[PDB]
Amino acid sequence: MAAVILESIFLKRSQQKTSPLNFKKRLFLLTVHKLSYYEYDFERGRRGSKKGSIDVEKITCVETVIPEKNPPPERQIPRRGAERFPYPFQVVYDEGPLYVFSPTEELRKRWIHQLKNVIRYNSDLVQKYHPCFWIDGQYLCCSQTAKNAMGCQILENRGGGSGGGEIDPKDLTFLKELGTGQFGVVKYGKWRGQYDVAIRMIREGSMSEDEFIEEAKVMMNLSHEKLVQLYGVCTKQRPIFIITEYMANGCLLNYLREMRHRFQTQQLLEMCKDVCEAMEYLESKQFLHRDLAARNCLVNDQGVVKVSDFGMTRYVLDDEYTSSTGSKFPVKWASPEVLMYSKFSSKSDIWAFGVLMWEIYSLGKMPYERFTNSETAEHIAQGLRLPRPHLASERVYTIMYSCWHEKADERPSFKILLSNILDVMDEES
Numbered sequence: 001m002a003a004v005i006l007e008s009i010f011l012k013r014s015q016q017k018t019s020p021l022n023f024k025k026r027l028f029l030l031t032v033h034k035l036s037y038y039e040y041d042f043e044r045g046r047r048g049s050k051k052g053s054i055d056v057e058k059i060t061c062v063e064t065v066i067p068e069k070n071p072p073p074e075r076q077i078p079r080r081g082a083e084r085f086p087y088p089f090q091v092v093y094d095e096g097p098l099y100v101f102s103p104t105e106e107l108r109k110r111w112i113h114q115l116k117n118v119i120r121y122n123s124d125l126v127q128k129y130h131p132c133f134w135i136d137g138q139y140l141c142c143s144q145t146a147k148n149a150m151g152c153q154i155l156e157n158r159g160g161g162s163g164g165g166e167i168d169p170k171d172l173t174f175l176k177e178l179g180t181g182q183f184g185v186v187k188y189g190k191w192r193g194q195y196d197v198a199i200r201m202i203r204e205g206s207m208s209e210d211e212f213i214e215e216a217k218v219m220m221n222l223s224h225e226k227l228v229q230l231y232g233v234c235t236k237q238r239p240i241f242i243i244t245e246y247m248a249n250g251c252l253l254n255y256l257r258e259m260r261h262r263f264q265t266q267q268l269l270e271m272c273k274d275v276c277e278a279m280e281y282l283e284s285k286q287f288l289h290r291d292l293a294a295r296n297c298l299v300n301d302q303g304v305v306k307v308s309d310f311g312m313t314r315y316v317l318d319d320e321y322t323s324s325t326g327s328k329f330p331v332k333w334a335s336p337e338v339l340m341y342s343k344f345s346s347k348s349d350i351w352a353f354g355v356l357m358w359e360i361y362s363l364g365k366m367p368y369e370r371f372t373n374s375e376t377a378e379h380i381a382q383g384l385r386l387p388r389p390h391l392a393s394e395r396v397y398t399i400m401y402s403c404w405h406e407k408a409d410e411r412p413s414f415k416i417l418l419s420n421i422l423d424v425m426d427e428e429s
């Protein structure tokens with residue numbers, strides 16, 4: 001008994017090369033599972049038989065379509081403010097694009113919104129799309145001769161949807177606790193009892209909410225297989241929620257400290273590759289993490305590590321964590337220029353990444369265990385560096401050691417570190 005999210009009568013266009021285009025009226029049903037269209041008995045006002053359906057999980061984008069240059073009377077905007085259907089929108093999926101015409105502009109805006117609410121958790125959401133129709137075996141925007149051609153224009157939002165990231169909490173279900181972080185409790189749940197999600201309940205007074213909500217517009221569009229995805233936010237309540245991807249195995253630091261796993265060195269290097277891939281992607285987007293550490297990484301059910309809580313440090317209101325000398329400040333992961341002058345940059349993240357590799361190959365051991373936070377800050381500025389873990393070969397140690405140079409300009413980039421890791425994987429394996 002799946003809930004029907006919407007119910008409307010649309011003008012569905014047939015999906016073809018030399019075949020004729022036919023438009024027919026259909027009743028579309030939208031659920032969390034499928035998007036189906038039926039025949040409609042208008043005289044009896046009754047839904048007819050089913051003529052087709054599309055898997056929700058297979059939809060990659062929903063957006064409007066540039067109207068036709070010379071449409072027929074049935075699909076023209078009226079000259080004077082279920083007969084007319086002059087407002088089209090497209091649903092992109094493997095089986096080419098489905099084109100649906102709406103009678104009113106407001107109705108089209110409601111379906112694109114609800115459709116996005118239903119596909120925002122899909123893993124195949126695209127960042128490009130064809131803003132024009134597909135006619136004569138070709139696209140009118142790019143002239144590609146394949147319905148599965150890569151999008152020719154950039155979408156304003158990942159997966160379409162034209163805020164757009166406002167998830168309604170009535171469809172969320174809390175099922176299990178996941179602990180507490182800097183912003184409060186985090187729980188495991190499902191959206192419409194289907195898509196697994198993690199719900200971050202932000203304690204009031206712990207986050208600069210207004211500043212983050214402005215950045216969530218950009219973080220939502222960031223997507224990488226090794227990056228914990230941000231789905232949306234719930235900001236019409238107290239406290240607000242942040243819906244993100246769910247990671248079953250949890251924190252990486254704890255994951256490394258369970259001696260039962262008995263990791264192989266190949267597994268440890270794969271963890272470094274996963275993180276490096278995510279940082280390289282953030283590096284390409286001018287995005288900084290500012291707090292890279294094993295504690296801030298997560299592991300999924302398949303043992304894949306993903307970077308999480310990237311850029312969230314700029315909104316922490318706790319001074320004990322923001323101040324360079326606060327008890328919560330990550331002194332043991334900060335570069336000398338950060339502790340001395342607060343000079344943050346991509347190279348400061350490279351330093352933390354080198355410490356992250358040291359944590360992975362040390363199986364969650366605290367760095368500079370014999371030193372306190374104050375003792376570490378004074379000694380790392382003099383030349384104190386972490387030793388080579390026992391499970392780390394000399395070549396692997398050379399990679400993490402290169403991240404700890406005195407001059408930030410002398411440290412490698414995430415693009416070079418990935419090449420170094422991929423090189424070791426190809427030789428030491």
Ligand SMILES: C[C@H]1CN(C2COC2)CCN1c1ccc(Nc2cc(-c3ccnc(N4CCn5c(cc6c5CC(C)(C)C6)C4=O)c3CO)cn(C)c2=O)nc1
Nearest residue numbers: 178179180181182186198246247248249250291309312313
């Ligand atoms: C593995 C099982 C084991 N289980 C035992 C077995 O019986 C009990 C307990 C549960 N446990 C478990 C399972 C799954 C998960 N998954 C998730 C955890 C978290 C999570 C939870 C609590 N605190 C945090 N942190 C920690 C980091 N951080 C936070 C906010 C900020 C930071 C850094 C900052 C200062 C920049 C700001 C922050 O919120 C996080 C990471 O976001 C987030 N996401 C998306 C998840 O998917 N975690 C734990």
Ligand SMILES: [Zn+2]
Nearest residue numbers: 130141142152
């Ligand atoms: Zn195109």
